[PDB]
């Protein structure tokens, strides 16, 4: 679990010190909450006060309760109009939010509807024409539809929540989100919750928010989960090349990536593997951007079954799939190790990496597992792709 990092030092560790209406407290305690989570102690207050907030939070009942409590506290109950709009990336999530919102707002007399559609895109419209719910939660496509078709009104919307933004932008709702925002009033409060914080999510906060409150959980975005890591005792450096060629005889290898610490060795190894009859593409730091574009297309096409390169750190390798990856030269630290063999994203958590260990290497780092802080078995005499 990373570490919490706000720009808002105020912290409230009780629901009673938050100035919530009595009826809302009843709903909160009746739902089973007793003491707020790390994210609530920091986010609920700046929301009720009306400031734009960014919260890096994993999915759960506690995260949903952050914006649910905030929204309910601002609703003007006698105003029979939609005043809050929550976007979620699926029908399922949207409906769970409605459940949570209704439960808490149960004792308040707060209405909340879920733009789902499903088997009712004609039926539910008959309910929206009858009453404007206080809170609307739906998916971006479906909500944007209801706004264009005038069954929802942006007129009294003062609170706009993007839940699981990273997801929603992966599922192609960026356009629909941008379009919905263009229909809301200028002074509209934006709350954005997302577990990851990639470039296009940051870009959203920059366009929709002003001097927002950030609550982040900085943690390594690359991991070794799923990567099977191995090492070979090579004794001395000179015997690395002979070990590499023997791996090709032992293992089945479609394509591979080989990391090297210096350029002078990338060029040395590139020609030696040419001489040993290998389709090889070489890449280093001294090259331009347009040069590397070329040697990467060769590799992505199959013209090279092997890419030998150097740690880039700033630039990630444009590699999608490979039988394995070889640390012919051990990286100097945990960060560089994780750049070379760590993968991003939640799925396809699978890989193979092999590290070559000289005796000099052992001296400078006592234990490989400890030094890089990960499991690394000695390579067996079996077969693992």
């Amino acid at each position: 679990e990373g570490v919490i990092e706000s720009n808002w030092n105020e912290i409230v560790d009780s629901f009673d010190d938050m100035n919530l209406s009595e009826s809302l407290l009843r709903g909160i305690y009746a739902y089973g909450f007793e003491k707020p989570s790390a994210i609530q102690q920091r986010a609920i207050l700046p929301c009720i006060k009306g400031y734009d907030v960014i919260a890096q939070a994993q999915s759960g009942t506690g995260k949903t309760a952050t914006f649910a409590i905030s929204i309910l506290q601002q609703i003007e109950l006698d105003l029979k109009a939609t005043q809050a709009l929550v976007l979620a990336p699926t029908r399922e999530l949207a409906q769970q939010i409605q459940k949570v919102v209704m439960a808490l707002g149960d004792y308040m007399g707060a209405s909340c509807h879920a733009c789902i559609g499903g088997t009712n895109v004609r039926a539910e419209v008959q309910k929206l024409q009858m009453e404007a719910p206080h809170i609307i939660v739906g998916t971006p496509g479906r909500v944007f539809d209801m706004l264009n078709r005038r069954y929802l009104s942006p007129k009294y919307i003062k609170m706009f929540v993007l839940d699981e933004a990273d997801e929603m932008l992966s599922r192609g709702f960026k356009d629909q989100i941008y379009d919905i925002f263009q229909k809301l009033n200028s002074n509209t409060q934006v709350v954005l919750l997302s577990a990851t914080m990639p470039s296009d999510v940051l870009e959203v906060t920059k366009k929709f928010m002003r001097d927002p409150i950030r609550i982040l959980v900085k943690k390594e975005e690359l991991t070794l989960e799923g990567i099977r890591q191995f090492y070979i005792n090579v004794e001395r450096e000179e015997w690395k090349l002979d070990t590499l060629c023997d791996l090709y005889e032992t293992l089945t290898i479609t394509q591979a990536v080989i990391f090297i610490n210096t350029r002078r060795k990338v060029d040395w190894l590139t020609e030696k593997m040419h001489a040993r009859d290998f389709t090889v593409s070489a890449m280093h730091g001294d090259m331009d951007q347009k040069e590397r574009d070329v040697i990467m297309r060769e590799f992505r096409s199959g013209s090279s079954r092997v890419l030998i390169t150097t740690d880039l750190l700033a630039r990630g390798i444009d590699v999608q799939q490979v039988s394995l990856v070889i640390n012919y030269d051990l990286p100097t630290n945990r960060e560089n190790y994780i750049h070379r063999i760590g993968r991003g994203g939640r799925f396809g958590r699978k890989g193979v990496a092999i590290n070559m260990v000289t005796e000099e290497d052992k001296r400078t780092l006592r234990d490989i597992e400890t030094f890089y802080n990960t499991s690394i078995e000695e390579m067996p005499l079996n077969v693992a792709d």
Binding site: G172, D200, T254, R300, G344, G345, R346, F347
Partner: protein
């Protein structure tokens, strides 16, 4: 002569050769409509966000690639006619398209069971009933562990389309919008041989088992 935007459509339609070059930076941009700048490259077109270098402004449908995940282009983004559609290079990646549905780009190592699972939370899929069917374009690199692409368990219909050979090769997938929720997808392969010509990426009829 013709804006590059048009020369590309020409290649796709007739079935000529015209390689595409993408700047890795496009992958920072979420799926959707994106303003990009085309440049004449070496016997093809380069797509980046740089206006210099004899650049021609264009507005495309864009679908990036993202390590360990699926990226989806939504059907409601598909309307402006003769608009070009592009996805990042395919080098292990699968691409699945629904007729008037979304278009998914799947990272190479994502087990079919796991991406199918993710796809099915999408409204268009939840609108696709057990026992009934839809049109589906589906490309996957040739000779890749079945568990990474084979959807026989979920779909009953013509076999998928493929690119490369022996889990080696790159493919590019483009498209042209032909109405609301409709576009004609094309493709081309790059291999040690060289770069092949454009060609249709058909949508066969698939029935849903579960």
């Amino acid at each position: 002569p013709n804006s590059l935007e048009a020369q590309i459509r020409q290649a796709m339609k007739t079935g000529s050769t015209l390689t595409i070059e993408f700047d890795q930076a496009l992958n920072q941009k979420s799926p959707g409509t994106l303003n990009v700048f085309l440049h004449p490259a070496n016997g093809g077109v380069r797509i980046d966000l740089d206006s210099g270098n004899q650049g021609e402004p264009a507005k495309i449908l864009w679908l990036p690639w993202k390590q360990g995940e699926l990226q989806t282009l939504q059907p409601g983004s598909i309307s402006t006619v003769d608009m070009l559609f592009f996805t990042y290079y395919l080098s292990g990646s699968k691409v699945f398209a629904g007729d008037g549905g979304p278009v998914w780009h799947i990272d190479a190592p994502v087990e079919a069971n796991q991406f199918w699972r993710r796809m099915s939370s999408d409204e268009w899929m939840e609108d696709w009933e057990v026992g009934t069917d839809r049109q589906v374009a589906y490309l996957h690199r040739a000779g890749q562990s079945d568990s990474l692409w084979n959807l026989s368990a979920y779909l009953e219909g013509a076999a998928p389309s493929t690119y490369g050979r022996d889990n080696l090769g790159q493919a590019v997938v483009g498209g042209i919008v032909t109405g609301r929720q409709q576009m004609s997808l094309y493709q081309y392969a790059t291999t040690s041989s060289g770069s092949s010509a454009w060609s249709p990426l058909t949508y066969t009829l698939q029935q849903r088992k579960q």
